[PDB]
């Protein structure tokens, strides 16, 4: 129960952060995509 | 386990997590200014 417990808020809280990262990759990108369309 | 480990890696994703919200920040202006100049240049 302890232990477990623990471990298994670390995993949720890490899967939430890979997540947010992967979103926020992709949002990067396509402003980049934005971008080299102002600038075509 | 090893629970320092795992909370080093954690925080260097909250890290990684608000380096990229400053990127997408940053972006965020300068697509925003290239729509002004695009505009302004236009006329």
């Known amino acids: ?40 | 386990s090893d629970i320092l480990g795992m909370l080093k890696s954690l925080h260097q994703l909250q890290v990684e997590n608000r380096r990229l919200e400053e990127q997408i920040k940053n972006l965020t202006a300068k697509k925003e200014r290239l729509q002004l100049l695009n505009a302004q240049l236009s006329v």
């Open chain 1, 1 to 40: 129960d302890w232990a477990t417990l623990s471990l298994e808020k670390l995993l949720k809280e890490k899967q939430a952060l890979k997540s947010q990262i992967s979103e926020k990759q992709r949002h990067c990108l396509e402003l980049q995509i934005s971008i080299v369309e102002l600038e075509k």
